[PDB]
Amino acid sequence: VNSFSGYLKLTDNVYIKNADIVEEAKKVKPTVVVNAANVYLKHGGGVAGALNKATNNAMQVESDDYIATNGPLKVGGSCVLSGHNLAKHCLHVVGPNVNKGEDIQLLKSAYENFNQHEVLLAPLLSAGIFGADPIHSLRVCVDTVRTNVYLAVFDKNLYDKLVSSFLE
Ligand SMILES: Nc1ncnc2c1ncn2[C@@H]1O[C@H](COP(=O)(O)OP(=O)(O)OC[C@H]2O[C@H](Oc3ccc4c(C(F)(F)F)cc(=O)oc4c3)[C@H](O)[C@@H]2O)[C@@H](O)[C@H]1O
């Protein structure tokens, strides 16, 4: 249905809201919801952990099946799997793990996957356990994605810092 509302428009195509991406998915019912994944699609926490939990582990079983057939993803790569009860499709995207020393330029490649989809509900890739600077991730998203991206930022403190950092 893609009935997004409450988002602050940052650019022609990038929108931001302070919300839980799970809550937004069940209110919006988007065509595509983005997961901030690892290369093994092991959904152990953060966005992935919340999305998986909202699918009742169904997302995890499907993801294991994908990994069993294709093997781990590449950092910066993606794969289109089922959205289950949250969306039509889930676009799993692997941002770089900057904490481990992975190349942050792979964050451009990660966001580039967004361009194959007309509208996405998405988180800030690599901005959590992967330790990428939140402002930088939003900048690469803005500089990279040309389709319509609705970013759900769970943390209010981070949301206010991104809005003022961008719209100011
Ligand atoms: N519900 C939400 N809705 C909207 N936005 C949200 C939401 N929740 C977070 N964000 C925000 O999204 C942005 C991205 O953060 P993420 O950490 O989800 O993604 P990432 O940085 O690209 O790293 C990718 C990895 O994370 C996941 O693995 C883990 C594993 C363990 C933990 C643990 C702990 F078990 F070790 F303790 C604590 C923890 O907090 O997170 C983990 C992530 C996933 O399997 C992948 O391997 C941040 O700005 C965050 O603040």
Residue numbers in the entry: 3 to 170
Provide the authors' original text about this structure.
However, SARS-CoV-2 can counter IFN-induced mono-ADP-ribosylation (MARylation) in host cells through its first macrodomain (Macro1) encoded within the non-structural protein 3 (nsp3).4 Macrodomains are ancient and well-conserved structural modules found in a wide range of proteins with diverse biological functions. Macrodomains are known to bind, and in some cases, hydrolyze ADP-ribosylated proteins, thus functioning as either “readers” or “erasers” of ADPr modifications. Viral macrodomains, including those of coronaviruses (CoVs), the Venezuelan equine encephalitis virus (VEEV), and the Chikungunya virus (CHIKV), are reported to hydrolyze MARylated host proteins and are responsible for attenuating host immune responses against viral infection. Given the central roles that viral macrodomains play in host cell immune responses, macrodomain inhibitors are potential antiviral agents. Viral macrodomains, which can bind to and/or hydrolyze adenine diphosphate ribose (ADP-ribose or ADPr) from proteins, have been suggested to counteract host immune response and be viable targets for the development of antiviral drugs.
